[PDB]
Amino acid sequence: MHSNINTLIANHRAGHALDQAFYTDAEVFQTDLQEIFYKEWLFAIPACELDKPGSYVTHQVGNYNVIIVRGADNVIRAFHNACRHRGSVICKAKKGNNPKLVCPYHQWTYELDGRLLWARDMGPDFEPSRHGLKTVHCRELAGLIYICLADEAPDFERFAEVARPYLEVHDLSNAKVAHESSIVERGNWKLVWENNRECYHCGGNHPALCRTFPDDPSVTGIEGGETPSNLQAHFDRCEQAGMPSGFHLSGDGQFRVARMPLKEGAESYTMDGKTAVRRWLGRAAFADAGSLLKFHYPTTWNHFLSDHSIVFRVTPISPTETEVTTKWLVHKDAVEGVDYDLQRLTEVWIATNDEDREVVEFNQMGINSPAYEPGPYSPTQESGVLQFVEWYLSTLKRNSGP
Amino acid sequence: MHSNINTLIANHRAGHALDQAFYTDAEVFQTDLQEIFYKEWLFAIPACELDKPGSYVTHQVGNYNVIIVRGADNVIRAFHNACRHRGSVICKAKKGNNPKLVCPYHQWTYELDGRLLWARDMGPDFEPSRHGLKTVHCRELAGLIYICLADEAPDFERFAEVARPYLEVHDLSNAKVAHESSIVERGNWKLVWENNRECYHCGGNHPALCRTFPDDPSVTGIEGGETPSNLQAHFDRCEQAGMPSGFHLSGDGQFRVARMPLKEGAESYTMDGKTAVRRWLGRAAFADAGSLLKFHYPTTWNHFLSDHSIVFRVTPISPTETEVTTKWLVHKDAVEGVDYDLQRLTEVWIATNDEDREVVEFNQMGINSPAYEPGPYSPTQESGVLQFVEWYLSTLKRNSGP
Amino acid sequence: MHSNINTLIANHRAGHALDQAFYTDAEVFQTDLQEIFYKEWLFAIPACELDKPGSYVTHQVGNYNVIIVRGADNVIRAFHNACRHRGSVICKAKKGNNPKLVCPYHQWTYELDGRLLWARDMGPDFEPSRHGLKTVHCRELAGLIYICLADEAPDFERFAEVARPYLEVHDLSNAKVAHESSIVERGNWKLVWENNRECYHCGGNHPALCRTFPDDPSVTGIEGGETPSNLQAHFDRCEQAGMPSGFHLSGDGQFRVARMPLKEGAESYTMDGKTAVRRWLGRAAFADAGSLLKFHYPTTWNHFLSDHSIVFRVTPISPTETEVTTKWLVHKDAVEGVDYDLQRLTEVWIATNDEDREVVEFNQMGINSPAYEPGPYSPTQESGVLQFVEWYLSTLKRNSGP
Numbered sequence A, B, C: 001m002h003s004n005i006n007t008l009i010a011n012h013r014a015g016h017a018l019d020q021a022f023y024t025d026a027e028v029f030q031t032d033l034q035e036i037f038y039k040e041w042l043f044a045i046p047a048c049e050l051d052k053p054g055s056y057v058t059h060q061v062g063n064y065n066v067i068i069v070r071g072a073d074n075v076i077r078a079f080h081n082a083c084r085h086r087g088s089v090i091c092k093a094k095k096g097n098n099p100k101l102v103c104p105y106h107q108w109t110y111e112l113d114g115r116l117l118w119a120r121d122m123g124p125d126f127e128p129s130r131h132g133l134k135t136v137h138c139r140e141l142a143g144l145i146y147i148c149l150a151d152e153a154p155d156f157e158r159f160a161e162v163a164r165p166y167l168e169v170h171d172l173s174n175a176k177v178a179h180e181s182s183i184v185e186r187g188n189w190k191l192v193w194e195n196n197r198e199c200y201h202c203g204g205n206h207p208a209l210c211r212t213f214p215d216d217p218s219v220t221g222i223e224g225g226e227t228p229s230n231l232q233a234h235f236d237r238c239e240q241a242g243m244p245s246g247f248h249l250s251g252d253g254q255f256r257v258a259r260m261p262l263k264e265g266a267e268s269y270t271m272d273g274k275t276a277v278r279r280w281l282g283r284a285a286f287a288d289a290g291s292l293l294k295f296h297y298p299t300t301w302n303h304f305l306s307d308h309s310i311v312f313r314v315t316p317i318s319p320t321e322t323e324v325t326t327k328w329l330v331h332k333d334a335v336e337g338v339d340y341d342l343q344r345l346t347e348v349w350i351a352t353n354d355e356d357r358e359v360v361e362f363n364q365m366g367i368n369s370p371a372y373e374p375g376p377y378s379p380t381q382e383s384g385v386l387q388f389v390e391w392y393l394s395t396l397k398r399n400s401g402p
């Protein structure tokens, strides 16, 4: 199926959803890994997860597995989780703390910067300098760790310069992960995004979220117009109080920040609309700060509120499988059972994620039929989906080309 | 493996079973879907399952999923279970009742004839007339629903004209499904058929069925001879009493009807040989009416008795997986616990199906070996298998050709 | 991936581990089956498992399944487990006893030499002489059964002549299987071997085994040197007492025998180092006889002790899956609960196998990464791994070539 990616891209019907092969074909999926996930910057973890020198996590991206580890100098570095002897995984656990990286097979021992310090009985010609752990590009942006698997990484600095002032409001280096949830959705990674970038399905599918989150297309979507005055008043209210808020969509479509108002009265994504956490994460001047929306394709969407923040990570597994990992961030000194209640903090987005998963899964299932033919996106209700698809096709064409 | 279907077909050894690739190869399986299951008429359901206007079922055939739904005008129609917006499955459940077909993703709402009645905020250029549900051919034959996935369906009327008078004896529009059983057999769909079209394995494998069902090859098989006089006397007894019974095999081999006698004394497929249901389904003049045998390749075999009927449906899943769905039909006013007992009604064919599944599964497992070489079919004991294989190869060659 | 096996082999970096494709690629795995497992001699079972005329086992090798059966004349024969009618498996069970081989589908009945004795109603032209069970080459070597799936088997006699005198010490025709364990390791079959042919990982991974088994590289490995004097003294002690012991590695690298000393004091692979069984299997002159090490690629490694013996069998399942079957052999008259205790006899190698499985599985997982690059084998600690890889590449090149 599809001949080649060039022909598939050239056949796309403007304003419509993607040809079936984009969502089902095994070769297109490998192209998506090679041209997108193995070339672009990827959101990995909040930095607060690496709490001490020697702290690490491991992270699977396609066929890669990456160790992300905080050094004795407190700098976070990334490496391929693959011993230079016979290839074994070095860190078997998803998280831990170790003063060295020690391969469990034959004990080759690496410094937390990747250098091989000891390898037993390798004989007179062995060169430890040629057998250090292979490196992965790693950046820290206002308390969030990004990685890149390519030999040569694209620019990070345009993104960082735009996003840093919005993100600094939330003091994320002093957060902790109050809760993590990882779900596997039986849909193509692109269907997860298309679903995330519209609220056309909200009225019919999200009771708990719709108590606080407007299904206004100017909030979620990408509109060409002058800013609606309710949005602008919120931007000005927040900026007068020292919280960067104005809408910014990058020129190439990869990322967007905007601090959008919630529904009348609402402070946070909770059943009652009130803040979940009594000790707030960051410097929000008032409880009804709305939500700082941030996306950065292909891996992350996020909501940063007055009291807590929620960071999301998308990792493709197969043409019809995608992991979504959600983390709720609260102030590091906020105590469960005193300053917040775990169920109250998490229930809205746990329910919302499952609802999104359901619609994505039945969308994929219908797309599997040879009868599927892509229809048109709603110009007003799915402007964000059109924008995502344009980012994807344009990026695929550029990264594939010369 | 096999180069192409033309070469595989051209290499078939007359009178022998099929080359391994026919039963194992992934490309041959896709050819079977494309040339047979996606082109021919397929038995779906008894009409009695759609009990009211708005009633529907869904049905998977290969990668297709079909909604079969009874309209407000009582006409049963079929559609692809795929929304014209972004492709979602519309009906998630295997069965239900709805006055409209409403997509659960963004609520596009279709009439029970497939027309798009409402789609929210699709903008000034949207044409609802171009976004109706895609249709599937659908026919009702004496209370049985058949479908066809091809753009242009083959003739149905020769089949219907032959079969209708035999089928009308059983008054199937006034039946109900007393019981349904669906099993996945770990064999190629062709092995399920080859097994169904012989009773060479009966003596060794079916104790409960052999109490009532003769393993005479003139009953199950396809013999060139003049009709054995015990069979002819039954045909005449039944026809004198107004029940069409005489043997008919279609010219192209696709279908066969004949009302065959059961063993001495037996009325029905029960452990004691007596009718299972006190209130009979249809107009049988006497209890020992034998069984109306009907096959129609590639999807259905059936047994219609004096008291009840059993209809079977074969749907391929993978090269080594096949679903067999069995439904026991009784008169709609027959009450479980009064007019019949569920265990008594169903036990013989539940056991027989499991026995068939076992032999099919160990046949497939042996065929998987590179040592497998097709042997000869018994000319007398497997005349029906030879006939099935000839239908399959001839149909594959015709549908593939110009 | 890899273009073809010739190019992959030609690109191997001397002294290093194999390119990723050798351990992951589906086509290379099929080449390994076709060129190695379907051409060479394979260890199947100890003969003592077939205790009586009519006794059989079945054995899966890739897509083949083999019946190994003891005849009424006490000769063990092998056949393809595939009926000559429609291909069914004949023997569904892993083991049993039958005076004839009777197909369960339609009862074709074969003699224990494979000849078709009866097939019902096959008509006047049927030739039973042309429908006997297809044969598999089968040899018995001092109580151990080997098979070969090729039309023409390679020489067995050089192997047999070398190994017989070492093996006869252990009187294996008078053993019984005290215990069997089969585990599926989530690694390529070559990783199982590479792991087996070194003790570089021993210090870090095998507490129970290291109580008795030296991690000396001259014991496990393949060294060019003059024999270390502790090894030679053991060879001479054992040979003076009539037990063949001296090191022999075949010219082509396929097999090796040597009776190696265990650690100070140790008699057997037990937690306390003492013999597990009071009634010894074979003629060992003293309890501290060391272990007769035997490998024969691609299927078997073994340890034969004074008191009991352990025989191991490697069967590939998929590119990343390998079955390891371990059998503990004791004297046929040794009684569990009197002459030995099952836990004491088996615990060391059950634990050791699981430990090996763990390291093999995490080695495979790391190798799956596109970042994997083969490193160098330890010249002194992994001489046996270098030797195995050389046997594999040389055999693959010879069997593939003209």
Ligand code: FES
Pocket: A083, A084, A085, A086, A087, A088, A103, A104, A105, A106, A107, A108
């Ligand atoms: S594979 Fe890591 S030390 Fe050997």
Ligand code: FES
Pocket: B083, B084, B085, B086, B087, B088, B103, B104, B105, B106, B107, B108
């Ligand atoms: S996919 Fe059906 S309404 Fe959107």
Ligand code: FES
Pocket: C083, C084, C085, C086, C087, C088, C103, C104, C105, C106, C107, C108
């Ligand atoms: S398949 Fe063995 S007797 Fe028919």
Ligand SMILES: [Cl-]
Pocket: A196, A301, A302
């Ligand atoms: Cl969102």
Ligand SMILES: [Cl-]
Pocket: B196, B301, B302
């Ligand atoms: Cl039948």
Ligand SMILES: [Cl-]
Pocket: C196, C301, C302
């Ligand atoms: Cl060993």
Ligand code: NI
Pocket: A195, A196, A201, A202, A206, A355, A356
């Ligand atoms: Ni949603």
Ligand code: NI
Pocket: A016, A375, A376
């Ligand atoms: Ni259109």
Ligand code: NI
Pocket: B195, B196, B201, B202, B206, B355, B356
């Ligand atoms: Ni049967």
Ligand code: NI
Pocket: B016, B375, B376
């Ligand atoms: Ni023949």
Ligand code: NI
Pocket: C195, C196, C201, C202, C206, C355, C356
């Ligand atoms: Ni080991």
Ligand code: NI
Pocket: C016, C375, C376
């Ligand atoms: Ni090197």
